[PDB]
């Protein structure tokens, strides 16, 4: 499409007028991590999606806390490959949507509210506490039966 758009502008712009300004505004999602972090703190970004996975991990640990401090409505969507697909990459890590068509304005606002109710209400707790207490099943059998059988003759 980019290639097509370059050819179209040359035919219109030289002959009549304009600085490429004839072409309409582009609305699209913002995929680069550095760019989105830069979009946050302005603060211009209405939604951020953060992939749960990512091999460094340290890369994206700060982003939930940073979004909270700035007050961007963040989410943690499952899978980085999914984010990739919407943005024409193999993997995207984060995706933020900064602008919206007037028709699409209503839908965006209500999604953010859903995310706050669905994510933000229950996850004051999530900041707190330590995951991964869980034991393997052979060890679970051993703890339960020892504890249970000791109590009851």
């Amino acid at each position: 499409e980019k290639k097509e758009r370059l050819t179209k502008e040359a035919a219109a712009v030289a002959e009549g007028k304009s600085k490429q300004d004839a072409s309409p505004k582009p609305y699209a999602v913002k995929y680069g991590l550095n760019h989105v972090v830069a979009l946050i703190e302005n603060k211009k970004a209405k939604l951020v999606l953060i992939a749960n996975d990512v091999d460094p991990i340290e890369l994206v640990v700060f982003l939930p806390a940073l979004c909270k401090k700035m007050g961007v409505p963040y989410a943690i969507v499952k899978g980085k490959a999914r984010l990739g697909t919407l943005v024409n990459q193999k993997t995207s890590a984060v995706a933020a949507l900064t602008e919206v068509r007037a028709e699409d304005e209503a839908a965006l606002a209500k999604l953010v509210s859903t995310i706050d109710a669905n994510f933000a209400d229950k996850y004051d707790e999530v900041k707190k506490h330590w995951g991964g207490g869980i034991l393997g099943n052979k060890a679970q059998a051993k703890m339960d039966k020892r504890a249970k059988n000791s109590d009851s003759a």
Binding site: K110, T114, A117, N118
Partner: protein
């Protein structure tokens, strides 16, 4: 304590009792379901109540469904306190008119015009707005 009765607000157009029943049955078989509707004009006021049979199946069907984004709505569902109960909520049909009249004879209701005309000319004088005829 919480009851088996359940309160569903924020319902899309074409979420009616047939559908609510057919959906929420899949959690567990239910005693009664009722939607609030307008009289005037037979269509939904976007909230209803169900009541199950078990207590614990109702609060599960609350827990899954409490901020469920659906059309341009999100469904909010509450479980009531003990008792409360589904009281009323009659399923209104659309109300068609009918031209019930006119029993009185023409020579009577002509004199109602002639009298109730002369009411108005006296009435407007009391305001007061001085006027002939």
């Amino acid at each position: 304590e919480y009851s088996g009765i359940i309160y569903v607000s924020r319902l899309p157009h074409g979420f009616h009792e047939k559908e609510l029943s057919k959906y929420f049955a899949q959690f567990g078989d239910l005693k009664e379901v009722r939607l609030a509707r307008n009289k005037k004009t037979g269509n939904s006021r976007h909230y209803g109540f169900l009541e199950f049979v078990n207590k614990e199946d109702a609060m599960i069907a609350q827990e899954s469904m409490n901020n469920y984004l659906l059309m341009g709505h999100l469904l909010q569902v509450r479980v009531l306190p003990k008792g409360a109960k589904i009281e009323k909520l009659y399923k209104y049909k659309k109300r068609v008119l009918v031209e019930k009249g006119i029993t009185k004879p023409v020579k009577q209701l002509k004199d109602n015009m002639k009298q109730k005309h002369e009411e108005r000319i006296k009435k407007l004088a009391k305001s007061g707005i001085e006027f002939k005829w």
